[PDB]
Amino acid sequence: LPAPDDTGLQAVLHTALSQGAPGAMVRVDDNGTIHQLSEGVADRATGRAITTTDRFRVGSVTKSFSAVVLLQLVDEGKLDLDASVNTYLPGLLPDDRITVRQVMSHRSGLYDYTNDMFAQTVPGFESVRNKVFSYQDLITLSLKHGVTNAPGAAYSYSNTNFVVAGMLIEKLTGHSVATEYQNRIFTPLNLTDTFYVHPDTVIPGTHANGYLTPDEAGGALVDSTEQTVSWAQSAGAVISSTQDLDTFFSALMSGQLMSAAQLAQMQQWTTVNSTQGYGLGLRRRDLSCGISVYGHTGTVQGYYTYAFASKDGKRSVTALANTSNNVNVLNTMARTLESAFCGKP
Numbered sequence: 001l002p003a004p005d006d007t008g009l010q011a012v013l014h015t016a017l018s019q020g021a022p023g024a025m026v027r028v029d030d031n032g033t034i035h036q037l038s039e040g041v042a043d044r045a046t047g048r049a050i051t052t053t054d055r056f057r058v059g060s061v062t063k064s065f066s067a068v069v070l071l072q073l074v075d076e077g078k079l080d081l082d083a084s085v086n087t088y089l090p091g092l093l094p095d096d097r098i099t100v101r102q103v104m105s106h107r108s109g110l111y112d113y114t115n116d117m118f119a120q121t122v123p124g125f126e127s128v129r130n131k132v133f134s135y136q137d138l139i140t141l142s143l144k145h146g147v148t149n150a151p152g153a154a155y156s157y158s159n160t161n162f163v164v165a166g167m168l169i170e171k172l173t174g175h176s177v178a179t180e181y182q183n184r185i186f187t188p189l190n191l192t193d194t195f196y197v198h199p200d201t202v203i204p205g206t207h208a209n210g211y212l213t214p215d216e217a218g219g220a221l222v223d224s225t226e227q228t229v230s231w232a233q234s235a236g237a238v239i240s241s242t243q244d245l246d247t248f249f250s251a252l253m254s255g256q257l258m259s260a261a262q263l264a265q266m267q268q269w270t271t272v273n274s275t276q277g278y279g280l281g282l283r284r285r286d287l288s289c290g291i292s293v294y295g296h297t298g299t300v301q302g303y304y305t306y307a308f309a310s311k312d313g314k315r316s317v318t319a320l321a322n323t324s325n326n327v328n329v330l331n332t333m334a335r336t337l338e339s340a341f342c343g344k345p
């Protein structure tokens, strides 16, 4: 690979601050050589500076943790990817023909209930932040809508799919998703900054605060740090750090977290757009220099995450800006992948 470009990374963070992120940071593990940069503040009211050791909410990167657990269950013979969801969760879905593989690749047609919840950004956050949902509650919200496509027929990202994932994990194992994440992933990889505390609202230890951008341009930022994330759970509630997401996606891509056969299934790509694919709880992004990288993005209120690794896991990058509902920041932070993998032009 090209050398990572730290000057480029510094400019990405500086641009993200100019666009409204209180703080922005990035860590690269380049085959045992670390790159780490941060600019701005973890807490904009106290002025405490952001650092790459600050814990944060990873949002939908959680789906890759859920998918690893599920694929280990496939390895153990407890789950068949082409079986019906309803084989395992009787009566859950009205169409007993929707399969686990379709759910995990966002081809199931299940409507994304969060499109109800967050039509208005700050009101929607205020609605859900202190609510506790069951898994079934969220499925019922989705099923108020008809499916958006026939089973398998179309890619349509939906949080509901990884609510199903968490239900599958809990049913098949008899354990909570927190226990399964801990025993199958966090403990074996020594992810000392990684937690699943749902429905607790506290982020353990030193953390970046999250700042939700209101829909009104120029409006005052909302501290969105402390919330249950119960509207997402196994689709979105993990807490981690740049180092630990780097460790995780390197371990995934280098073949440490499941059989070779199941990693292959995880990397069967459904087209998302002309430069992106989706596997089983995993994204592929194609970079300008002809490199593809593998991992996941997250958007949860106040936090935008990118966490991606090269195909063999030897280079991994995690970037965080502590705002959300700010498309300019989201698009800027993607540039960390170009600077970290493609290097200086």
Ligand SMILES: *C(=O)[C@@H](NC(=O)CCCC[C@H](NC(=O)CN)C(=O)O)[C@@H]1N[C@@H](C(=O)O)C(C)(C)S1
Pocket (backbone or CB within 6 Å): 058, 059, 060, 061, 114, 118, 119, 120, 121, 122, 124, 157, 159, 212, 235, 236, 296, 297, 298, 299, 300, 301, 302, 303, 324, 325, 326
């Ligand atoms: C995962 O991160 C998941 N995120 C969400 O579903 C986002 C929830 C609302 C976020 C909120 N937006 C609004 O309130 C909009 N009015 C905000 O704080 O910005 C899905 N994962 C990502 C990812 O995979 O990139 C998606 C953007 C695709 S949605």
